[PDB]
Design a protein around this ligand. Structure first.
Ligand SMILES: C[C@@H]1CC/C=C/[C@H](O)[C@@H]2CC[C@H]2CN2C[C@@]3(CCCc4cc(Cl)ccc43)COc3ccc(cc32)C(=O)NS1(=O)=O
Length: 152
């Protein structure tokens, strides 16, 4: 019914949850599982590097957002639209979107608000898919993501 949304949510939710808890989800992927698995391998390799390369800026933005509760987490959609959607789209910026999401997910675990991680992943997915579908489709979706970051 909306295959790109469903697959995006699975990849994003899995990465954020795994980043927060330190444990891999053992459940099978849904449809397009082969691609989703490679997308997840790519985020672990690339997204983890991004959180370190931008550590000071990431810690700074986190502090500025001052996330304490569910209402603070709900406020993030507006900021993501402002910063991510209102700019050039490329894979790098999409990785920063998702990687900073993981950064926030880990924060939510530290403040014992782990229940907000899946809603956060839904919000990120809404921003990504619902504001950049045209670009994502043209760039071959998650297959394109995997191809873009491929290690020979
Ligand atoms: C060179 C650039 C990366 C480094 C920039 C870091 C910035 O200082 C802040 C640290 C977090 C980033 C702001 N923001 C983080 C935002 C905006 C802040 C709220 C938020 C919340 C969640 Cl859950 C996820 C993302 C975000 C929106 O997503 C992006 C996407 C691309 C770039 C920036 C960005 C963004 O600017 N990406 S980029 O690759 O062009």
């Amino acid at each position: 019914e909306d295959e790109l949304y469903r697959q995006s949510l699975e990849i994003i939710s899995r990465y954020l949850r795994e980043q927060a808890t330190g444990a891999k989800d053992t459940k099978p992927m849904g449809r397009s599982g082969a691609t989703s698995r490679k997308a997840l391998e790519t985020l672990r390799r690339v997204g983890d590097g991004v959180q370190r390369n931008h550590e000071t800026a990431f810690q700074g933005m986190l502090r500025k957002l001052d996330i304490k509760n569910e209402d603070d987490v709900k406020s993030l959609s507006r900021v993501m639209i402002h910063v991510f959607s209102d700019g050039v789209t490329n894979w790098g910026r999409i990785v920063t979107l998702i990687s900073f999401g993981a950064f926030v997910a880990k924060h939510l675990k530290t403040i014992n608000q782990e229940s907000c991680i899946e809603p956060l992943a839904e919000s990120i997915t809404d921003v990504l898919v619902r504001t950049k579908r045209d670009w994502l489709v043209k760039q071959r979706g998650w297959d394109g993501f995997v191809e873009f970051f491929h290690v020979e």
